[PDB]
Each structure stands twice: as C-alpha cells, then as structure tokens.
Design a protein around this ligand. Structure first.
Ligand SMILES: *C(=O)[C@H]([C@@H](C)O)[C@H]1CC(SCCNC=N)=C(C(=O)O)N1
Ligand SMILES: [Mg+2]
Ligand SMILES: [Mg+2]
Length: 466
C-alpha cells in the first residue's frame, strides 16, 4: 500500500511539464511523524505565495488570534461652542481591512463630536509603519497591479476581499470614434487621468490597456474598446495609499456636514501636541477573521502589513527588517527548524525568498498542534469548493476528485515558480505535504500538483464526490 504510493508519485513526477525543473516533494503522516515520501526535501527553492504560510503562523504567534487593528481621528483639542478645530489627523495603525464605509462612519463621529469646520489642514498619518513602500527586489513593471500595491499603515481596502492601496478603474464604450469613458473610482480627484482610449466599431478587437506609468500617479489608458463591449473593470494601484485615504476622508467629512478649509497631505501628529483629542475611531475585525480573505485569496498587502505589525509588536518598529526577524523568531519558538529559510518578504512576491519542502512540512506539523490550529486551518483554500470564500485559489481545481472538500492547502505561482502545500485529513491521520517546483519553462504544473494531492486523498481513504 505504501510502496504503491511511492511508485505513483514517482510516475507523476516524470511528467514533461517538469522538464529541467527542480521539485521539492515531501509527505508526512502527522499522527506518527512517518515520512511517506521525500524527494529533494532539503533543497532550497523559491516558495512564491507559499511564503504566506510562514507569515500567517508567525502573526498568530506574535499578535494572537484575538488581535485587532485601530484607526483614529485626532485634533489638538476638542471643538468649541463654535465647533471649530484647526488641523485634523487621520491616523492609521495597520488595519488591512479598512473600507470607504469605515471612513464615512468615522466622519459621522467627527460631526457627532461637535466639529463643523476644519479650519486648518487634513493630514494622513501612516507613521506607525515606515515609508518603505515596496520591497527592494520587487519588479517595477508589476507596480500597477493590485498584488504589488504600496505598503502603508494607513490604506483603504477595496471590496469584500479587502484589496488594499488600489482604485477600481471602469472603462465604458461610447459611440464608435468617441473616446472611451474612464471612471477612476475612489482615486477620482486623487490620481491623474491620461485617457487616450477610443471606442472602436461594434465587433472590433478589444485592445484596451490600463496602466500606471512607473513613478507617477497617472492612470494611463490606451487602445480601443468595441462599441458593443461590456464595460471593463480593473484594480490599479495608486501612489501613496495614505494620501488616497486622506482624500476619501475629506470627502466623507464633507458628506457628513464637515467643511474642510485647508489642504490634504501626509503628516504625523506633532510631538508638541500635549493631549490629543481623539474625535473618532474604528476597530477592525480580529486577526482570526482577517486570516480568511488574506489566505484564501493570497493577499500580498495583508501579508506585508502583518510583517510590519509583527515588527511593531516585537520591537516598536513597523519595518521589514524587524518584522522578518520577528517572523523567524516566532517560527523558531514554535519548534520549526529555520536553517533553510531565507525571508525577504511576507507575501512571497520577492524572488529573494527561499524555503525547503522539509521546512514547509515541519511548519505544517507545528502549526497543526498549536493552540490556534483551527483558526489557521480554516483560512486555507479547500480543494474544489465553489464558494470563493471557502475554495479560494483552489475553487476551480480538483473538483470531482477525492481531494474535493478534503484537501486544505496554500497555493503559489509566479513565472518559473509554483507551489502547493497543506493537509489531507484521513480516516487514519492528518497527512501534511509540500510540493515546490522551480525552473519549469511552460505553464505552472498545476495538474501535476493536483494529481499528487488527489493520490494522497485516495491513500488517506477518500473517494470523489459524484
Ligand atoms: C503568490 O504566489 C502570488 C503572489 C506572489 O502575488 C499570488 C497570486 C496567485 S495566482 C493568481 C491569483 N489567484 C489565482 N487564480 C496566488 C496564488 O496563490 O494562487 N498568489
Ligand atoms: Mg475624489
Ligand atoms: Mg473525498
């Protein structure tokens, strides 16, 4: 029975999709510590988004499942009979799920607190983290796209997935030959618009491109949208998420009857402020709930923000240097051997990250017996589950196989790198596996990863739902 499995995995790994690739594959029975399968287990490889496994476990160690995140609004003193204040500060302390609606609710509080007029300026304070927006070795060409959003302590999260530091651009065709209509979403009045796009004939080819040119705050739109096309939406990053948050907050104040007379910019609450008056605040959901959209959809912004929150909690430093040491120390304190680990970010976007499949499985075992094991487990994509908040990045993989509804695993893919690691619960014991592939030259070997996870599900005693 055990010899069949090794033969079957051996054969799966001969697939031509893995030509010239190195593949770390480890499978362990977690009830006994029995190594069921091991190849290139100690080989150092890029993890891509499997890096998030390390980040999530450390966040739960350092911050706790009950940890929540605060945002507040501050003036030098409370408002008067006249209901006036001078400068106002919106202060972000690392909430990765702060919505436009949370801004409106804080704006209503400011009004309710007696403010009618902000006579001075509105400043967006993100000083709880440092102002290092991107990791050194991240690629500049990626910057326009949600997964490369700038990192800040104060950022507005979009939608129920809470994509941070982005705006939703919507392009709608007009009559043929008329410019396409571009709607910048939340960044209206914040980001600049360079719209060169036209509406093409009905049935013409869609060549529409939406860019943010490197080192600018301009949404540049080119190409041609067919007159008969459905409108196109895309998430695009902005420069300085905190200043977009400031912009949206100004609007929310105005919309709740509070007149802002001055300008909007970045700035930290002055040191010379004696006893700041907190005029409004907001508390995020607890980390256990935040772990769901973070890990199910592999949210890079959430990961980096949790690293810096780790740096804040361990060292008073909202920094990658500090946060990444904190991740490593949390993992060690958990009993994980971190010798094979090189940590350059929390999300796994960085090509400077390294793991080994053995280190991954080690972590899977330690996390499985931690006090927070269930919270952690619930955050992982579940093979083949059609509800996006349940199936996550595995929603349309492994359907109608023994893995469906059973395998819980984290994904990860970029150019030349793909990974799948997690658990296979069986009638007998929970299996832990890690599959890390580097160096394949075609599509990410997802079918190969599926075949192994499916084989493990079967071995554990499972059968495909019909
Ligand atoms: C992790 O590997 C990357 C991260 C580096 O940006 C993200 C992107 C993806 S793949 C495309 C997103 N959803 C999949 N349809 C993942 C992922 O784990 O799938 N994480
Ligand atoms: Mg605006
Ligand atoms: Mg099954």
């Amino acid at each position: 029975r055990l010899t069949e499995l090794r033969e079957d995995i051996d054969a799966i790994l001969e697939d031509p999709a893995l030509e010239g690739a190195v593949s770390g594959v480890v499978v362990v029975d977690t009830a006994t510590g029995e190594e069921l399968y091991s190849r290139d287990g100690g080989e150092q490889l890029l993890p891509a988004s499997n890096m998030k496994l390390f980040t999530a476990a450390a966040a739960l160690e350092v911050l706790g499942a009950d940890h929540s995140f605060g945002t507040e609004v501050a003036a030098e003193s409370a408002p008067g009979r006249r209901g006036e204040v001078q400068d106002l500060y919106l202060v972000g302390r690392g909430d990765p799920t702060l919505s436009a609606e949370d801004l409106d609710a804080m704006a209503a509080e400011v009004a309710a607190s007696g403010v009618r007029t902000v006579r001075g300026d509105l400043y967006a304070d993100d000083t709880w983290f440092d102002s290092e927006r991107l990791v050194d070795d991240w690629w500049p060409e990626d910057e326009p796209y949600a997964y490369s959003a700038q990192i800040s302590a104060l950022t507005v999260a979009h939608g129920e997935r809470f994509d941070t530091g982005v705006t939703e651009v919507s392009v709608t065709p007009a009559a043929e030959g008329e410019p396409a209509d571009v709607d910048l979403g939340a960044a209206e009045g914040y980001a600049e618009l360079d719209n060169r796009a036209v509406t093409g004939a009905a049935g013409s080819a869609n060549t529409l491109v939406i860019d943010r040119p490197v080192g600018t705050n301009t949404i540049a739109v080119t190409g041609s949208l067919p007159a008969d096309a459905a409108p196109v939406t895309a998430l695009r990053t902005v420069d300085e998420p905190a200043a977009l948050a400031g912009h949206l907050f100004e609007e929310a104040l105005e919309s709740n009857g509070v007149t802002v007379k001055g300008d909007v910019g970045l700035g930290g609450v002055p040191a010379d402020w004696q006893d700041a008056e907190v005029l409004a605040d907001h508390t995020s959901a607890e980390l256990s709930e935040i772990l769901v959209p973070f890990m199910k959809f592999s949210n890079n912004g959430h990961a980096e923000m949790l690293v810096k929150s780790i740096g804040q909690e361990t060292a008073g430093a909202g920094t990658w240097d500090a946060g990444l040491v904190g991740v490593e120390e949390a993992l060690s304190g958990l009993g994980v051997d971190t010798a094979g680990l090189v940590l350059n970010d929390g999300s796994g976007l960085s090509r400077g990250n390294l793991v080994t499949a053995d280190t991954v499985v080690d972590l899977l075992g330690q996390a499985g017996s931690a006090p927070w094991a269930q919270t952690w487990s619930a955050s992982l994509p579940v093979a083949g589950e059609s509800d996006p908040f349940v199936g996550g990045t595995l929603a349309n993989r492994m359907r109608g196989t023994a893995a469906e509804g059973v395998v819980e695993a984290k994904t990860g893919t970029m150019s030349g790198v793909s990974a799948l690691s997690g658990y296979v619960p069986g009638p007998e014991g929970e299996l832990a596996f890690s599959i890390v592939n580097n160096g394949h030259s075609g599509p990410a070997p997802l079918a190969v990863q599926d075949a192994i996870a499916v084989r493990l599900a079967e071995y554990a005693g499972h059968q495909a739902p019909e």
